[PDB]
Design a protein around this ligand. Structure first.
Ligand code: NAD
Ligand code: NAD
Ligand code: A1AG6
Lengths: 271, 244
């Protein structure tokens, strides 16, 4: 019975589909080049991080990959090398502040000064507020938003000198609206969306032009991060990476995946 | 305006208010004392929270104070057991407490960022997590998350603060959706989102509201069970225009 009312939403998503693809062709945004840039990607051992390193390797960039999974990040670097990119990896606990700072100095003593940051890394512990463990909540924030500050903080001094960079904050639709069982996770993803919103307002207020900001906000991505989605599309690992590579190149502030989820958030502010 | 929202009574309820030694917290305890509530105040400032309780007592309310570091998890849990061994089971929570360290991302201290999150959102999980089971049992409560317009859109110099306030607005939104998904009706949620309030929290504004005006907006939003208490109410249409 509920499927009858659901066709109104289905018609508006196909309405946005032709409308968005018409703007991407009729009056399209200026695509830039990321060739020879120092692109650091945290959580690049699998999924959205792994396929972002594949997309940057296609653009002829200088990759630096960070992860806790030594094997996973090494295998991503292996397939990024098989594309022609210069790739150098480091096993970094992207939630630990003293490890991040320790590895930033090794990045400058080996690769140089990072010019593009991809704060992809994340952790999820799906449970109701009363069954979630305190350690899980702490680890959620430590990786999803606290860690974003230390990476951003250690690379921004150099991007400020050169007035050239790009801070990519990878968050989810759980940064625009909360879902059940993921309250600690949604709270951290909302914080990530606000950190990019404040970074964008403060970069602008300080006269900084050269440093752009992009925020990836997709729905369920088939990566194994969780088991099944929360509500009745499941984006693929590679489809999301193509959306992120295309959003960084046009310098878009909010990369919604799939884009129509912007009109759904508009309708939320009408009760 | 024509047929406006149903105002409820909060008389005889157990209202816990964190960060109630001054400003938005102090004037919320004054407004609840007017509503004839049983009050419980938490703060790090022993003198400030005792003086709020003193003026709340001079109104007729029964106020009990506890000096609690509302950012420390083991202190919060330790004091929740003292709240149940003295007052009883809390029925209304006011997550007011907050800390701000106004600076650019490169001049902010790491300790400041840590303390920002520890008070503004990490602390909001432990107090709610410990007061929620009895509320769940009784199917009656109200979780008030005090956030700022820095939870809907980021401002310069307050990036660590805006990041935590956004998290508070999302915790409220996630809690709301999960409360609904689990069949719980009796537990309502309100989120206070005002602009610059003259309290001395921050030196200069980012209209500028007064200490007491914001407290009246919060007391009126809890009584009508409104999910988003924007102060002032029109700042909702300004956020709509931002997505254009
Ligand atoms: N997959 C989804 O359903 C989905 C949807 C929207 C947004 N996202 C966001 O994308 C990110 C990851 O998604 P995914 O599907 O690529 O996940 P994934 O589980 O496939 O891979 C994430 C990677 O992060 C790494 N990582 C985790 N904790 C780390 C830490 N402390 N230090 C360093 N590396 C660490 C893991 O080793 C892993 O390789 C998260 O920030 C998440 O919020 C995911
Ligand atoms: N005042 C504003 O400009 C403004 C605007 C919007 C939202 N807010 C929100 O209101 C809250 C406080 O605003 P205010 O004007 O009432 O502030 P205030 O500085 O006047 O008082 C805040 C109170 O919180 C207490 N507190 C701080 N850290 C604490 C801790 N670790 N444990 C226990 N108590 C602690 C302080 O002792 C103080 O009495 C914050 O959550 C803030 O984000 C304030
Ligand atoms: C368990 N689990 C983890 C998920 C993650 C993740 O781990 O990041 C992201 C999305 C999920 N669910 S979803 O894809 O079904 C979905 C679709 C649409 C949405 O919102 C649509 C908008 C907001 C109102 C209209 C939203 Cl919030 C969610 C997830 N489910």
């Amino acid at each position: 019975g509920n499927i009858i009312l659901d066709l109104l939403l289905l018609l508006l998503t196909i309405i946005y589909s032709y409308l968005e693809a018409l703007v991407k062709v009729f009056f399209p945004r200026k695509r830039k080049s990321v060739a020879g840039e120092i692109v650091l990607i945290t959580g690049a051992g699998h999924g959205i991080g792994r396929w972002t390193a594949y997309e940057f390797a296609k653009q002829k960039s200088r990759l630096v990959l960070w992860d806790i999974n030594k094997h996973g990040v090494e295998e991503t670097a292996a397939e990024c090398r098989k594309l022609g990119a210069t790739v150098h990896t480091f096993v970094v606990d992207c939630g630990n502040r003293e490890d991040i700072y320790n590895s930033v100095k090794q990045v400058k003593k080996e690769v140089g000064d990072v010019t593009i940051l991809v704060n992809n890394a994340g952790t999820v512990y799906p449970a109701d507020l009363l069954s979630t463990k305190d350690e899980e909540i702490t680890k959620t924030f430590e990786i999803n938003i606290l860690g974003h500050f230390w990476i951003t903080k250690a690379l921004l001094p150099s991007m400020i000198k050169r007035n050239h960079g790009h801070i990519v904050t990878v968050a989810s639709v759980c940064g625009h609206e909360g879902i059940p069982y993921l309250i600690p996770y949604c709270s951290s993803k909302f914080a990530a969306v606000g950190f990019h919103r404040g970074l964008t307002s403060e970069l602008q207020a300080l006269g900084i032009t050269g440093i752009k900001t992009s925020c990836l906000c997709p729905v369920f991505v088939n990566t194994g991060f969780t088991k099944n989605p929360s509500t009745r599309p499941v984006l693929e690992t590679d489809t999301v990476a193509r959306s992120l590579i295309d959003g960084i190149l046009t310098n878009k502030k909010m990369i919604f995946v799939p884009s129509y989820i912007n009109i759904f958030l508009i309708l939320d502010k009408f009760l």
